[PDB]
C-alpha cells in the first residue's frame, strides 16, 4: 500500500538468444540500486531473487530452452510474493528479466488493489496472444492474459489457468511504441486501448503526453498506479544492452520526465523494470550504462529530481 519500498528480483526468460536477461537484477543491484533508494530516505525491504527452475524437467537443456508452462508457473509464485508485499504496505519494485513477469506482478497487485491502472512504457505493446506469435514470444505477449476483453481469443496454456484478467482496455496507456506487429496494431485499434507512439511524442511532447495520460487514467478518480517500464523504450544509444533494441526511442530527458511525472502524482504502487540483458552489450561500459539508466528510472519514480530535493538550513 506504497508507504515504503520492496525490491524483488525475478530473473525469468524463455532462454535461447535472450537468456542473459536473467542476469538483470544483479546488474541493476550492481548499479547501486539500494544505495540510491536508501539515500532517497526510503524504508526498503529487499525480498531477494526468486527461484526460477523449469517444470517438469530441470535437466540442463530445459534451463537453456525453457517451456511456457515454466514461466506461467513462476509468475504464479511471483503474483503471490507481490500480493503479500502490497498487503504489508510496500511499493513494489520488481527488477526483471523478460517483460513476461508483468503477468505475475500485475496479477499480484490487482489482487489487493482491484481499481489499479497501468502505464506501459515500451517500444513494443507486448500484446500478442498465444495464437498470434511463436512459442518463444511470451515476453512480447503478456498483456493478453491480463486484459479482460481478450479472453475470447486467449486459450488455456498449462501454467496459466490461475491468471484472472485484472485490467479493462480503458485502464492501460502505452507510451513509446515504434515496433508493433499487425496483430497487435489491430488489437489496439479494435478494443480502443489509448496509446502514445514515438510519432505522437514527436507531435505532442512528453509534457502534453503525460498530461493526456493522467486525464485518461486518474482524471475523474484517484487509482493506484502500476508502471511497467521496459528498458528497450529508451533509444538504443542510451540503452544498448537489451534483446530487441529498436531505434528512434526516448531520450534520457523524456524517460526521466515520465518517471518524474509518475512520482509527482504520489499514486505509484508497483514498478516493473525489464529486458535488461548484459550478455548483449558491446562492453562492460555498455552493460553498466544500461543498468545505470535503469537505476535512474526507479530513483526518479521514487522521488529523485534533476534540480534538488531533501532538507538543509545551512551554517556560517
Amino acid at each position, epitope marked *: 500500500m506504497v508507504h515504503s519500498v520492496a525490491v524483488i528480483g525475478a530473473p525469468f526468460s524463455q532462454g535461447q538468444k535472450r537468456k542473459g536477461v536473467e*542476469h538483470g537484477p544483479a546488474a541493476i543491484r550492481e548499479a547501486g540500486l539500494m544505495k540510491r533508494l536508501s539515500s532517497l530516505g526510503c524504508h526498503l525491504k529487499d525480498f531477494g531473487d526468486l527461484s526460477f527452475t523449469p517444470v517438469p524437467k530441470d535437466d*540442463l537443456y530445459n534451463n*537453456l*530452452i525453457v517451456n511456457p508452462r515454466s514461466v506461467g508457473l513462476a509468475n504464479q509464485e511471483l503474483a503471490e510474493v507481490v500480493s503479500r508485499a502490497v498487503s504489508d504496505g510496500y511499493s513494489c519494485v520488481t527488477l526483471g528479466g523478460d517483460h513476461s513477469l508483468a503477468i505475475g506482478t500485475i496479477s499480484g497487485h490487482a489482487r489487493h488493489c482491484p481499481d489499479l491502472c497501468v502505464v506501459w512504457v515500451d517500444a513494443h505493446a507486448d500484446i500478442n496472444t498465444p495464437l498470434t506469435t511463436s512459442s518463444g514470444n511470451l515476453h512480447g505477449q503478456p498483456v493478453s492474459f491480463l486484459l479482460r476483453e481478450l479472453q475470447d481469443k486467449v486459450p488455456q496454456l498449462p501454467g496459466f489457468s490461475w491468471i484472472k484478467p485484472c485490467i479493462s482496455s480503458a485502464s492501460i496507456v502505452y507510451i513509446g511504441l515504434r515496433d508493433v506487429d499487425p496483430p497487435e496494431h489491430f488489437i489496439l485499434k479494435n478494443y480502443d486501448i489509448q496509446y502514445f507512439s514515438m510519432r505522437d511524442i514527436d507531435r505532442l511532447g512528453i509534457q502534453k503526453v503525460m498530461e493526456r495520460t493522467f486525464d485518461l487514467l486518474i482524471g475523474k478518480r484517484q487509482r493506484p498506479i502500476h508502471l511497467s517500464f521496459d528498458i528497450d523504450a529508451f533509444d538504443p544509444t542510451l540503452a544498448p544492452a537489451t534483446g530487441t533494441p529498436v531505434v528512434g526511442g526516448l531520450t534520457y530527458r523524456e524517460g526521466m520526465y515520465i518517471a518524474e511525472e509518475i512520482h509527482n502524482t504520489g499514486l505509484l504502487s508497483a514498478l516493473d523494470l525489464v529486458e535488461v540483458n548484459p*550478455q548483449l552489450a558491446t562492453s562492460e561500459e555498455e552493460a553498466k550504462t544500461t543498468a545505470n539508466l535503469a537505476v535512474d528510472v526507479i530513483a526518479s519514480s521514487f522521488g529523485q529530481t534533476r534540480e534538488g530535493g531533501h532538507i538543509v538550513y545551512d551554517q556560517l
Partner: antibody
Amino acid sequence: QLLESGGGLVRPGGSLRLSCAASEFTFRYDYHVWVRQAPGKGLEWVSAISGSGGSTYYADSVKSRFTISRDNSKNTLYLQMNSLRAEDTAVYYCARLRADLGLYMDLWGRGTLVTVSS
Amino acid sequence: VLTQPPSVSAAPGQKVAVSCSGSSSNIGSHYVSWYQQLPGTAPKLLIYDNSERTSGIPDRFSGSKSGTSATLGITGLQTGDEADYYCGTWDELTSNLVFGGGTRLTVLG
C-alpha cells in the same frame, strides 16, 4: 578466446586441477562445458556449469570424481579431477554453451594434456 | 550414440556429404551442430540449428536434417579442409549432449 592449463602426467589414483581463462566480459553470463578427447578417439562431453555456479551437470563417465567450478571475479573456469585412471587420459577442452533453436558450442580452447600412466 | 561413417576421400574441387544417424530422443527431436577438428587443434563450430552457418565459413558448407538423420555437404573441396568432422545434439532419454564418433576427410592433392 578460451585458454586451458595445468594438465600434466599424474599417476593412477592421482588428482589434478585444470583452469580455463576466458577473455569475454560476457563469460560470467554464459554456460561453459568441459569436453575431453581420448587419444585419437572422439569427443566426450564431461561436465557443464551455469553462469553463476548454481547448477552443475556431470557425465556418468566422470561423475562424483570430477567437480566443475568457476570464479567469475577471475574470469576462470576450473575442473578438479580425483581418482584418475588410464581411461581419463585425454586432451581436455573448455567451451562456451549457448542456445537458439537448439544448443551449440561457439567458443573453444586450444586444449590441455592429461596423461594418467602407471 | 550418434553414428557417422569413419572416413571420406576426394581430390581438390570435388564435393562430399558426411551423414549423421541418431534416434527419436536426439536428432528426431533436437537440433544438430557440426564441428571441424583441424588435425592437432581444438575443434571449431561450423553449423548450428541443422543448417545455420557461422561467420566467415563459406557457403560451400551446408547442413540438413530429416527425421532421425543429418548430413554435412561440402563442395569445391580444398586443401586445409581435410580434417575430422563430428555431429552433435542433445539426447532427451539420457539428458546429455552427444556427438558422433567423427569422420576423417582426407583431400588427395
